[PDB]
Structure 1
Amino acid sequence: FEGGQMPIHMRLPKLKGFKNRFRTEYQVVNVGDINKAFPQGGTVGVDELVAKGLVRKNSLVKVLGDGKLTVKVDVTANKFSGSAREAITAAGGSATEL
C-alpha cells in the first residue's frame, strides 16, 4: 500500500519475456577450478567434479574456460564452452562431451 496512488508494483510495466518451461540449465565449473581441484590432471567426469565439490550431485555439468589450465585432463561434461574445450586441448587433455 502506498497511500492510494498507483503502487510501484502496478504503475511499472511487467518485465518482458517468458520463462521457457523447458529451458535446459547447466551447473557450470570453470577450468580454473579444474586446475585447483586436480593438480594431477587425469580423468575428470561429472562424478569426479561432484566428489571435489565443484557442481551439484545430479545435474547437467558444463565446463567454462575462466581460469587457466596447465594439466592434462580428460574432462567429460554435458557441454564445453569454446574456451574450455580449447584450454582442455591446449593442456594436452581431451574434452569428451557426453
Structure 2
Amino acid sequence: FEGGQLPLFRRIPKRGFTNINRKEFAIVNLDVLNRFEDGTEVTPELLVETGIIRNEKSGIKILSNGNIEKKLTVKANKFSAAAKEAIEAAGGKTEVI
C-alpha cells in the first residue's frame, strides 16, 4: 500500500501466459559424469541410483558446463549440441531414449 498513490504493480502491464504442456528437464552437467568409471554405460536409472538427480522431471538433459575426462556411453532424453560434441570428443556414444 502507498497511501492511495496507485501501487507499483497496477502502474505496469501483465505479461505472457503459462504453457499447460511446459516440459522441465533435470540438468546433468558433464563435470558429475567424471564420478563414473571409464568405459561405463550411464543411463537415467544409474544417475538416480548414484543420487546425481533424485527427481527426473520430464527427462534428463546433459549440458556442457565443465569438461569430461572418461569414455562413457551416455543415454539421456536430451543433449545440448556442446554436450554431444564433448562426450564424443572424449570418445563416447550418446543415445537419445
1:66 alignment partner in structure 2: 65
The alignment covers a number of residue pairs equal to 95
SS at match of 2:73: strand
Q: Which string of whole-angstrom CA distances, capped at 9 and with x for unpartnered residues, describes residues 10-68 of structure 1?
A: 11222x22121111111110111211x21x13111111111222223343100011111
2:54 aligned to which of 39, 51, 56:
56
Identify unmatched segments of 5+ residues in structure 1: none
Checking the alignment, whether the CA contact within 8 Å between 2:26 and 2:55 is kept in structure 1 is: no
C-alpha displacement at 1:7, in angstroms?
0.6
Identify unmatched segments of 5+ residues in structure 2: none
SS at match of 1:94: coil
Checking the alignment, whether the CA contact within 8 Å between 2:25 and 2:56 is kept in structure 1 is: no
Scaled by the length of structure 1, what TM-score is found?
A: 0.87
1:77 alignment partner in structure 2: 76
RMSD: 1.3
Q: Give the residue type in structure 1 aligned to 2:45.
A: D
Checking the alignment, whether the CA contact within 8 Å between 2:75 and 2:96 is kept in structure 1 is: yes
**Cα distance in 1 for residues equivalent to 2:55 and 2:46:** 10
Identity of aligned residues (%): 43
**Cα distance in 2 for residues equivalent to 1:7 and 1:65:** 43
Checking the alignment, whether the CA contact within 8 Å between 1:27 and 1:56 is kept in structure 2 is: no
